[PDB]
Amino acid sequence: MIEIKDKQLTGLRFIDLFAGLGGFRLALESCGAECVYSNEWDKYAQEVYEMNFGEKPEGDITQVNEKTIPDHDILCAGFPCQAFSISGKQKGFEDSRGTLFFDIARIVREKKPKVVFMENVKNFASHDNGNTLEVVKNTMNELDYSFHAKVLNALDYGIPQKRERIYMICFRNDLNIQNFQFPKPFELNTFVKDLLLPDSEVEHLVIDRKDLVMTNQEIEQTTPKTVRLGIVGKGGQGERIYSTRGIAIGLSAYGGGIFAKTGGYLVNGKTRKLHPRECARVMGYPDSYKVHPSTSQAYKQFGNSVVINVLQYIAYNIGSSLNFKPY
DNA sequence: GGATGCGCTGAC
DNA sequence: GTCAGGGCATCC
Ligand SMILES: Nc1ncnc2c1ncn2[C@@H]1O[C@H](CSCC[C@H](N)C(=O)O)[C@@H](O)[C@H]1O
């Protein structure tokens, strides 16, 4: 993550729904905002959250009385995406994990915060012929909010990972916010090899598959894209190897394969998956962030997380817009 | 819970 | 046609 000198959100309260690792909390706090409530039902996610923020998020949001939630200015929610991912069955609102947005709507209807800041996977924008995005838009508008949605790729904001997500920012209409803008992209100057730990710390992550098929030559010149160098098995998810001179393949929460969750990388002549700390770095988390003791759970958490830097730029812009109140 | 072979849609 | 997409099925 980056340093934010002008605290655009100082004095503003926000809630951390579907908290996870608390990526929204890190981003919003770096801009000066104060967290007044967090909710996350996964046991291990609650543990890592408490380990880093000192509080256990409340459980199952579908069972929380929206009226009990503290007053706040900004509602943050990177709600579940398994039901909208191209990797899944895409059942959307017909999936038990695909109706959480309506819980958000229920909370917004009651608390009416100045801003609703949501995030989901890129495919969310075109899921079900775009009908899914339209439902969220209509819902937000009927709740009396504007709706700004855009798919952003982490590689355009200083993070060496090809991770496209949709970001949805909504302003309460009475605020008359007319100048919100999504961050403008900038040249990437960091690559996977720049975030790697020393070899002595990741020997256990080395995988030697005798069915490895190198499909391309390694590159010496860094590039802002994923560069596949080979495959293992049938080359399915988790069986693909990339160059550390390019950017990271998108981390996964429920992904499989011998290189599950992180994908494989060619490092000093060997093929290995990433270490939880390297996953934290490709997601923009500071090295001071404490990862969950269970590597399996840590990989899951990071594969579900938000890219901090991207949220920081957006949060800064949200604050910038809220602060422009000329006579 | 941990691990991994897989399935197959879809962006372009 | 290529290969990415940040899940599913099932074993212990
Ligand atoms: N009904 C429910 N109540 C509370 N939390 C829920 C929930 N359904 C899903 N979740 C939680 O929603 C999260 C979505 S992933 C969001 C991760 C978060 N932005 C962070 O930065 O890492 C998951 O951690 C999941 O356990």
Radius of gyration of chain A (CA): 20
Q: Which amino acid makes up residue A203?
A: E
Residue owning the nearest CA to atom 26 of ligand 1: A42
The protein footprint on chain B, as nucleotides within 7 A of a CB, is 1-11
Beta bridge partners of A170: A116
Alpha-carbon distance values, A114 to A11, A182, A254 (Å) = 13, 18, 34
The two tokens of residue A135 are 């439902």
Question: Of all nucleotides in the shown strands, which has a C1' nearest the CA of A260?
Answer: B4
- Find the A44 Cα to ligand 1 centroid distance in Å: 11
Task: Check pocket membership of A85 for ligand 1, CB cut-off 6 A.
Answer: no
Task: Give the neighbor-by-neighbor strand order of the sheet with A228-231.
Answer: A213-214, A228-231, A240-243, A264-267, A270-273
The two tokens of residue A92 are 């959307």
Stretch (H or E) spanning A303? helix A295-304
Cβ neighbours for A220, distance < 8 A, ≥ 6 positions apart: A245
- Find the A82 Cα to ligand 1 centroid distance in Å: 11
**Angle at CA of residue A39, ends A35 and A42, nearest 5°:** 135
Question: Of all nucleotides in the shown strands, which has a C1' nearest the CA of A225?
Answer: C4
Contacts of strand C, CB cut-off 7 Å? Answer: A 81-82, 84-89, 121-123, 162-165, 215, 226, 228, 236-238, 240, 249-257, 303-304
Give which of A145, A109, A171, A117 is closest to A322, Cα–Cα.
Answer: A171
Structural domains in chain A, sorted by start: 1-187+304-327 (3.40.50.150), 188-303 (3.90.120.10)
Breaks (C-N over 2.5 A) in chain A follow: none
DSSP tag of A95: S
